[PDB]
């Protein structure tokens, strides 16, 4: 309905990577690997702990993932396209400037810090038959995700499916 | 009603700026100098011609003006930052994340290559009292302004004030 829980199937989408090229998830998945989606609210910005916020952003530690990363924010191509270039990614990053899929996804923050419809951050681990293998999300958006222990999941889900 | 035309008063607002920094148009007026507008669609996007695009925005050209100048688009403040930042800009960067400004300014693209509600290329020159004295608005997105004219305007109201 607009509802993605585990193990259930991951519902489709097309969104523009930064150079504009349109993204399907399924056409995704049709390529063999797990897909691997990473909701985040802003290019550009810190994470923080108690007090101590920075701009050491582990996310490149995702290219060690055997699994196709698409990570999405509500940021525009442009944007995302400074932002992958300035940080080297491999990966491609996404445009949901519209929201549909941070609304498809039940991944969004209402109001944050005045800013209306920003992605959560969030981790989905999508099989190539559709289905969601790992989910993980979070209610503060400073708060940085594990992305060694996504690797390790993404990559013992991709093994699994060699077996 | 939803609607800013030459002679007649320009409409208030608060945006955040690239600083999270609450900034209100009948404030910054109180300050006692003209208020440049300029919208504009994407941080980091180009500008082109027949056919040569390139990054060569000339917008640091306005920091010449004798007025405050508020450059407006709908991304979020710290990609606002990043963009102030690299480009080295003297002046404010205000978030219209929301859509209200390009909204109540009637400057804004429906659809701009698959991008919903992305603001118009546009200046507003408004005077201390709230009228507006200068409108330029174009339908093309890559076509950048002439920000040496914008300059020569402002100041041209900026000295009529003190006169």
Redesign the interface.
């Given at each position: 309905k607009g509802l993605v829980e585990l193990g259930e199937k991951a519902p489709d989408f097309t969104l523009?990577n930064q150079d504009?090229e349109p993204v399907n998830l399924y056409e995704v998945l049709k390529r063999g690997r797990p897909a691997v989606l990473i909701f985040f609210p802003?290019?550009?910005?810190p994470v923080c702990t108690k007090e101590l916020c920075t701009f050491r952003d582990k996310m490149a530690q995702l290219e060690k993932a055997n699994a196709e990363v698409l990570a999405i924010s509500v940021?525009?191509?442009?944007?995302l396209?400074?932002f992958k270039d300035e940080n080297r990614l491999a990966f491609n990053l996404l445009?949901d400037?519209?929201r549909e899929v941070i609304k498809l996804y039940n991944v969004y923050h209402e109001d944050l810090?005045?800013?209306?419809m920003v992605a959560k951050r969030a981790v989905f681990i999508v099989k190539p038959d559709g289905t969601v293998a790992y989910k993980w999300v979070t209610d503060n958006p400073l708060n940085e995700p594990d992305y060694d222990e996504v690797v390790r999941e993404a990559n013992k889900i991709a093994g699994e499916l060699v077996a």
């Open positions: 523009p504009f802003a290019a550009f910005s940021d525009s191509p442009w944007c396209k400074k445009s400037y519209n810090k005045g800013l209306k």
